[PDB]
């Protein structure tokens, strides 16, 4: 019925794969997402491990189309850093989207939670950071190369793989994308709703979006990320942010941050669309920090 186009090929509700709902169990309920509950889940000795984004039995014709759309979405990508998609079960009620499951959580909670304190001192370094950085660059960038703007890139909707060493961050949510999707604007949301801390002059003012979009959010992501997971502009509501960036202000740098992961940031924060950084550029300049001795020997902050 809806058709989604993405790369050039169009694919509809029958080219997602139909679950049974047998092989589906729920093991432990991980919150609310954007309009529904998420679970922990398996599929079939060695079950593969998913995360069950859940439609509410209760909703609307449009929240059904929005919830068939994500599914679209996320299973027409294929990276490494954006979270897989197992299948869908849309033939049973409640219906669920299967999605490869992201044990450490979202990136924003972890960074918070894993702020170097007096009990765990060494929890996370300047490489980690990187690392994480680099990992959401590369699905950035084939977003990028595939014309797709995520058009709401931030800690909040990034995941990691697992809580220790070896984590994979990845992209995980594509709700901002499917709500313009399918009206062309943000009929589901509102300005209070929107992400006005994450967007660039040109989005906010003329509703004008670009891969250059994603750069700008990007830029705030890895102020998240340095910060260890503080809210963007600390004190400034959304409409002082708003007249802020305008203004062109920007951002100071998170505490103790390395000068050259901060001149990343303000390269992002660029006024000009085209003065910013295409996500080929940010990666090599996140691969030079992360061989730079000065940057990645730099000590986080410890949180009392
Ligand atoms: C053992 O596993 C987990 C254990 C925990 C989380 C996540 C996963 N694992 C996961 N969560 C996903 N979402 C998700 C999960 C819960 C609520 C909302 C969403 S959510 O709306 O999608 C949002 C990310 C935009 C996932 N989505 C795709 C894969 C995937 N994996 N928790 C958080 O993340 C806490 N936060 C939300 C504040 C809580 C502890």
Known sequence: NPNYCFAGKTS????????????????????????????????SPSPLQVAVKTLPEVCSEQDELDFLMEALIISKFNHQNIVRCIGVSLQSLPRFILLELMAGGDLKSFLRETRPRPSQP????????????????????????????????????????????????????????????????????????????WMPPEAFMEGIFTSKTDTWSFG???????????????????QEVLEFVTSGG??????????????IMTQCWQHQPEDRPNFAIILERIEYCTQDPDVINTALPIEY
């Open 12 to 43: 509809s509700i029958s080219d997602l794969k139909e679950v049974p709902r047998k092989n589906i169990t729920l093991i432990r309920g991980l919150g609310h997402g954007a309009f529904g509950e998420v679970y922990e889940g398996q599929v």
């Open 122 to 197: 060494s929890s996370l370094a300047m490489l980690d950071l990187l690392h994480v950085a680099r990992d959401i660059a590369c699905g950035c960038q084939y977003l990028e190369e595939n014309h797709f703007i995520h058009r709401d890139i931030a800690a909040r909707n990034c995941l990691l793989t697992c809580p220790g060493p070896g984590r994979v961050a990845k992209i995980g949510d594509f709700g901002m994308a499917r709500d313009i999707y399918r009206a062309g604007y943000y009929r589901k949301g509102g300005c209070a709703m929107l992400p006005v801390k």
């Open 220 to 238: 705030v992501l890895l102020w998240e990320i340095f910060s260890l997971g503080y809210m963007p502009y600390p004190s400034k509501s959304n």
């Open 250 to 263: 920007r951002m100071d740098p998170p505490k103790n941050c390395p000068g050259p992961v901060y001149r």
